[PDB]
Structure formats: structure tokens, C-alpha cells
């Protein structure tokens, strides 16, 4: 360690997490809104697709003011939504067992909730230092992405 750092986070992270979400607004003569997407991570020049606990009700959309889940069916154009994906994990493989890594995103709107390498819960943080398990898996309580807009088509 030879590098001056007055911030809590290491240089500013070695795993770039990239959620790609597509929100489609409902129509007012009715077209049901939809929301779909995946989560990708870069690590040691490789891309990895995130694994989820469930294929159903594995994420929650919220408008501001309210913790109340918004039906994908009744998304509105022009409203800032936050998407909170639960029980996210990455399988970085057995060759990466036991490595300590920092998760971050080049997207400011992305936050993480999970257990860090010092075994503390952190909520809605821009970076999380985790220890990969004996199989090279990183587990997260959730990943949030803010300022998702449903597009009118």
C-alpha cells in the first residue's frame, strides 16, 4: 500500500457491476407496461452474468416518497423509478476462491447492500469490499439502480 487514500474505498473498485434494465410505460386503448433486464460484472478482463434466487418476484420497483411496489403493468413515462434486485450473486469461479475484491459501478445510480469482508452489513453504498467464498462466489442482499424511466412506445 503506497497510495494516499482519505476515502473509505480502495483504488476505485476492481469489479464493475452493470445492470441493464429496459422499462416500457403503459398506455392511456391500453398497453401494459413491462420491465426486464440482467446484471453483468467485469473482473480480471472477464464478464459474468449475475445469478438470482428466483425467476419470479425477484425485484421491486419504487417511485420516490413511497416504499410501495409499483406493478410493471402500470409504469408511467417521465417518473424516476428505483429498481431493487434481491439475492444477487456472481460466480467468479474456483480459481478466484478467497480473494478480497471491491464491487463498484461506473453508474452513480447503482448501490449495493450486503456483508463486507469485515463481516459488517452495509446498505445502499457505492462500493462494497467482499471476500469471495471457497468457490469464488460473491453474494449480495440486493443491488439498487435509481433513475430508471419507463419509455412510451
Count of strand segments: 10
Q: Which percent band covers the strand fraction?
A: over 45%
Radius of gyration: 17 Å
Q: Tally the helices: what do you get?
A: 0
- Binned, the helix content reads under 10%
Largest sheet, described in full? 5 strands, mixed
The secondary-structure class comes to mainly beta
Total domains: 1
Sum up the overall morphology in one term: elongated
Give the ordered list of helices and strands. Answer: EEEEEEEEEE
The largest sheet has its strands arranged as 3-2-1-6-9
Distance between the termini: 52 Å
PDB class: structural protein
Keywords: Surface Layer Protein, SlpA, S-layer, self-assembly, Lactobacillus acidophilus, structural protein
Assembly: monomeric
Entry title: Crystal structure of S-layer protein SlpA from Lactobacillus acidophilus, domain I (aa 32-198)
Topology at a glance:
Layout (H helix, E strand, L loop, with lengths): L14 E10 L9 E10 L2 E4 L9 E5 L17 E11 L8 E5 L5 E6 L5 E5 L2 E4 L5 E12 L5
Parallel strand pairs: 1-6
Antiparallel strand pairs: 1-2, 2-3, 4-5, 5-10, 6-9, 7-8, 7-10
Amino acid at each position: 500500500a503506497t497510495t494516499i487514500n482519505a476515502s473509505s474505498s480502495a483504488i476505485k473498485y476492481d469489479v464493475d457491476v452493470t445492470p441493464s434494465v429496459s422499462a416500457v410505460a403503459a398506455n392511456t386503448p391500453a398497453i401494459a407496461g413491462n420491465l426486464t433486464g440482467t446484471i453483468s460484472a467485469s473482473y480480471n478482463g472477464k464478464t459474468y452474468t449475475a445469478n438470482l434466487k428466483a425467476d419470479t418476484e425477484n425485484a421491486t420497483i419504487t417511485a420516490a416518497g413511497s416504499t410501495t411496489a409499483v406493478k410493471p403493468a402500470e409504469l408511467a413515462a417521465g417518473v424516476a423509478y428505483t429498481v431493487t434486485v434481491n439475492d444477487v450473486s456472481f460466480n467468479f469461479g474456483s480459481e478466484n476462491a478467497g480473494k478480497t475484491v471491491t464491487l463498484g459501478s461506473a453508474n452513480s445510480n447503482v448501490k449495493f447492500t450486503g456483508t463486507n469482508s469485515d463481516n459488517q452489513t452495509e446498505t445502499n453504498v457505492s462500493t462494497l469490499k467482499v471476500k469471495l467464498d471457497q468457490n469464488g462466489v460473491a453474494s449480495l442482499t440486493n443491488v439498487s439502480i435509481a433513475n430508471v424511466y419507463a419509455i412510451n412506445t
